[PDB]
């Protein structure tokens, strides 16, 4: 009595990202009936492990608890003991959405050009991928790239850009990245110049700058009041987010001339001078 | 003894706006000398009043206390050593102009992305010189200065050929041959060519059960003329409220009359000549309970 063995490989009916629905194609078989038990054997390809299995009452079965984008192999055994496995079916599960690229940075390269960069990407699957970049009013860049040049923009403009990673699935959008093109003109001077916490040795100085002019740096020049002074002091603040400063080491009962500048890709601003800093006796 | 009278008119040799230097031209004369005293008579033309007079010891006198751009007439009388003779020929001269004050009601207003219009009240000067208006356009750093002269019968000058979203300093003065006083600088922005950035630095503080204080920052230079604060109860909704602020210098706002223990969706917009900005959202408006 020849042990029965299916004619056709199992058929995949519906595939998800975590589940596969299979028609095991038990019948028709070759050999002698009747059949008292049908077994579907399944296993992720290139995984060194024993085959998993379940008994199938009928013809249709759903494999749950699967992994994304994984290829699985399927075959069926029938019992009249156990016979030879039928033809093998291979299928791959579905892609899930990828999170946006890491270390996203949008930076000015010119007055008409922004550069968007991200960290190199290592997916959990061998999907072919590209990055979709959206300027918020679309350009598709090959996934082997980590930088995209956004051209033909206008000087002194503010742009918002987001990205996502596309395979077959569509990716999760990044949060917007806001950046400015470089300025075409000199920056405006610092504003709201107040001086507080005067001592005999020190004083606090604060200001605000206007956004939109690519102000990358701030110079605070101070100097003892005289028509005859051989020395002045330039403090150079290369991070234009700092908006206050403690002046220390001054001379008591002394009048100072304080000037505050702001610079960008074009040049410096006019002096935002302050009405006199005069330290206290002692 | 035929009474002595000068033959030439006095000569004006220097001229200011408040003074005149005169050679009285006493000699040569007609008649019989010698000369005991010389007298220069002078008067503002078209002034119904008596002639003023000054004694001149020698030949050169300096008339002070004069008025700007005023026509005067001069003549000289002589006394001999042994009364007063005929006045000599008359010399007319006009004093010099002083610098006029700047135009009044000065106003600089943006008309387009590339045009500013400068206006002023019609000018009625204290003299009758042919005058003009000089308009000086500079940048904030006083870079590309452009001077334009406009005929004095005009009250408006269009300063086109500029650039969108830029600031310009404009001052004016009224000139004759005497240069006028420069007016105070007027600064104005050209109209935007693009939509305004959304307001930023949005802060919601002083939360109560009834209110809150919304602060924000907008960017100068985009010709932003209005601010819209739109808030609804978080939920579709059958109603919402639009606070409309026409003074774009207001950066705070006190929302009042708010239901206790409730969540609001607050959006803030910026409006200019091109249109409206993207909304500046905040889900952060959640009041405190009646307690």
Swiss-Prot record, chain A:
Tissues expressing this chain: Detected in umbilical vein endothelial cells. Proteolytic processing gives rise to a soluble extracellular domain that is detected in blood plasma (at protein level). Predominantly expressed in endothelial cells and their progenitors, the angioblasts. Has been directly found in placenta and lung, with a lower level in umbilical vein endothelial cells, brain and kidney.
Notes concerning its domains: The soluble extracellular domain is functionally active in angiopoietin binding and can modulate the activity of the membrane-bound form by competing for angiopoietins.
Protein name per Swiss-Prot or TrEMBL: Angiopoietin-1 receptor
Residues of the whole record sequence present: 442 to 734 of 1124
GO cellular component, one term: cell surface
Chief localization: membrane
Family: Belongs to the protein kinase superfamily. Tyr protein kinase family. Tie subfamily.
Intracellular or extracellular location(s): Cell membrane; Cell junction; Cell junction, Focal adhesion; Cytoplasm, Cytoskeleton
Source species of the chain: Homo sapiens (Human)
């Amino acid at each position: 009595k020849v042990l029965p063995k299916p004619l056709n490989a199992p058929n995949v009916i519906d595939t998800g990202h975590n589940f596969a629905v299979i028609n095991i194609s038990s019948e028709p078989y070759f050999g002698d009936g009747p059949i008292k038990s049908k077994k579907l054997l399944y296993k992720p390809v290139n995984h060194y492990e024993a085959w998993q299995h379940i008994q199938v009452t009928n013809e249709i079965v759903t494999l749950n608890y699967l992994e994304p984008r994984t290829e699985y192999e399927l075959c069926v055994q029938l019992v009249r003991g156990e016979g030879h496995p039928g033809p093998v079916r291979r299928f791959t599960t579905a892609s899930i959405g990828l999170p946006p690229p890491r270390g996203l940075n949008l930076l000015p390269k010119s007055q008409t050009t922004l550069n968007l960069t991200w960290q190199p990407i290592f997916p959990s699957s061998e999907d072919d991928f590209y990055v979709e970049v959206e300027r918020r009013s679309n350009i598709k860049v090959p996934g082997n790239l980590t930088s995209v040049l956004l051209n033909n923009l206008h000087p002194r403009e503010q742009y918002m850009v987001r990205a996502r990673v596309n395979t077959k699935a569509q990716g999760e959008w990044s949060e917007d990245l806001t950046a400015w093109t470089l300025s075409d003109i000199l920056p405006p001077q610092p504003e709201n110049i107040k001086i507080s916490n005067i001592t005999h040795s020190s004083a606090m100085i604060s200001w605000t700058i206007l956004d939109g002019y690519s102000i990358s740096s701030i110079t605070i020049r101070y100097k003892v009041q005289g028509k005859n002074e051989d020395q002045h002091v330039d403090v150079k603040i290369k991070n234009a987010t700092i908006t206050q400063y403690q002046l220390k080491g001054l001379e008591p009962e002394t009048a100072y001339q304080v000037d505050i500048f702001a610079e960008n890709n074009i040049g410096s601003s006019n002096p935002a001078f302050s009405h006199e800093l005069v330290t206290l006796p002692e």
